[PDB]
Amino acid sequence: DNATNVKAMKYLIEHYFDNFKVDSIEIIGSGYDSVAYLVNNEYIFKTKFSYAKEKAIYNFLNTNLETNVKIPNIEYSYISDELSILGYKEIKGTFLTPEIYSTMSEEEQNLLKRDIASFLRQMHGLDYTDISECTIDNKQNVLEEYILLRETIYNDLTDIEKDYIESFMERLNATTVFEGKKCLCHNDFSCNHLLLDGNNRLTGIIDFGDSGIIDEYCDFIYLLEDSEEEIGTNFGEDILRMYGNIDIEKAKEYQDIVEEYYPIETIVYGIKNIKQEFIENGRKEIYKRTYKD
Ligand SMILES: Nc1nc2c(ncn2[C@@H]2O[C@H](COP(=O)(O)OP(=O)(O)NP(=O)(O)O)[C@@H](O)[C@H]2O)c(=O)[nH]1
Ligand SMILES: NC[C@H]1O[C@H](O[C@H]2[C@H](O[C@@H]3O[C@H](CO)[C@@H](O)[C@H]3O)[C@@H](O)[C@H](N)C[C@@H]2N)[C@H](N)[C@@H](O)[C@@H]1O
Ligand SMILES: [Cl-]
Ligand SMILES: [Mg+2]
Ligand SMILES: [Mg+2]
Which residues on neighbouring strands pair with residue 196, listed in sequence order? 94, 202
Q: Apex CA 191: angle with CA 212 and CA 274, to 5°?
A: 60
> Distance (Å, rounded) from C-alpha 20 to C-alpha 150?
49
Ligand nearest to the CA of 30: 1
- Answer for the pair 242, 229: CB distance below 8 angstroms, yes or no: no
Task: Name where the chain breaks: residue before each gap, C-N > 2.5 Å.
Answer: 50
> Distance (Å, rounded) from C-alpha 211 to C-alpha 54?
8
Q: How was this structure determined?
A: X-ray
- For 133-148, the three-class secondary structure string (H helix, E strand, C coil) is CCECCHHHHHHHHHHH
Q: Which among 77, 88, 31 is positioned nearest to 204, based on CA atoms?
A: 88
CA of 144 to the centre of ligand 3 (A): 21
> Distance (Å, rounded) from C-alpha 66 to C-alpha 70?
10
- Answer for the pair 221, 255: CB distance below 8 angstroms, yes or no: yes
Ligand nearest to the CA of 228: 2
Q: Where are the beta strands (DSSP E) in 80-148?
A: 84-89, 94-95
Q: Verify whether residue 188 is a known catalytic residue.
A: yes
What 3-state DSSP class applies to 235? Answer: helix
Question: Residues 163-171: contacts with CB within 8 Å, 24+ apart?
Answer: 164/263, 164/264, 164/286, 164/289, 164/290, 165/264, 168/260, 168/261, 168/264, 171/257, 171/260
Question: Amino acid identity, residue 218?
Answer: C
> Distance (Å, rounded) from C-alpha 112 to C-alpha 101?
9
**Residues in Cβ contact with 270 at an 8 Å cutoff, skipping those fewer than 6 apart:** 276, 277, 278, 279, 280, 281, 282
Question: To test the ligand 1 pocket, which listed residue (202, 207, 210, 273) has its Cβ within 8 A of the most ligand atoms?
Answer: 207
Q: Out of 3.90.1200.10, 3.40.50.300, 3.30.460.10, 1.10.10.10, which CATH number does the structure's domain 93-293 have? A: 3.90.1200.10
> Distance (Å, rounded) from C-alpha 225 to C-alpha 232?
6
Q: Is 207 annotated as a binding residue?
A: yes
Alpha carbon 250 to its chain centroid, in Å, reads 20
The burial class, CB within 10 Å (0-12 / 13-18 / 19+), for 37 is buried
CA of 227 to the centre of ligand 3 (A): 26
> Distance (Å, rounded) from C-alpha 152 to C-alpha 255?
28
Backbone angles phi, psi at 216, to 5 degrees: -40, -40
Give me the residue spans of the domains in the chain. Answer: 6-89, 93-293
In 10 A of CB 82, how many CB atoms?
7
Q: Is the CB of 186 under 6 A from ligand 1?
A: no
Q: Which among 68, 20, 15, 79 is positioned nearest to 46, based on CA atoms?
A: 79
Please, what's the b/e burial string for 97-120 (b: 16 or more CB within 10 A of its CB; e: otherwise)?
Answer: beeebeebeeeebebbbbbbbbbb
Alpha carbon 120 to its chain centroid, in Å, reads 14
> Distance (Å, rounded) from C-alpha 129 to C-alpha 133?
9
Alpha carbon 180 to its chain centroid, in Å, reads 21
Task: Indicate which residue's Cα is closest to atom 19 of ligand 2.
Answer: 188
How far is residue 117 from each of residues 113, 244, 248, measured CA to CA in Å? 6, 9, 14
**Residues in Cβ contact with 26 at an 8 Å cutoff, skipping those fewer than 6 apart:** 6, 37, 38
Active-site position among 137, 188, 238, 247? 188
Q: Which among 53, 51, 58 is positioned nearest to 33, based on CA atoms?
A: 51
The resolution in Å comes to 2.4
Q: Apex CA 252: angle with CA 250 and CA 253, to 5°?
A: 60
What 3-state DSSP class applies to 198? Answer: coil
Q: Out of 2.30.130.10, 3.30.70.420, 3.30.200.20, 3.40.50.2300, which CATH number does the structure's domain 6-89 have? A: 3.30.200.20
> Distance (Å, rounded) from C-alpha 173 to C-alpha 80?
38
Alpha carbon 19 to its chain centroid, in Å, reads 32
Taking every pair of Cα atoms in the chain, the longest distance, rounded to a whole number of angstroms, is 60
Question: Residues 16-24: contacts with CB within 8 Å, 24+ apart?
Answer: 16/78, 16/85, 17/76, 17/78, 17/87, 20/76
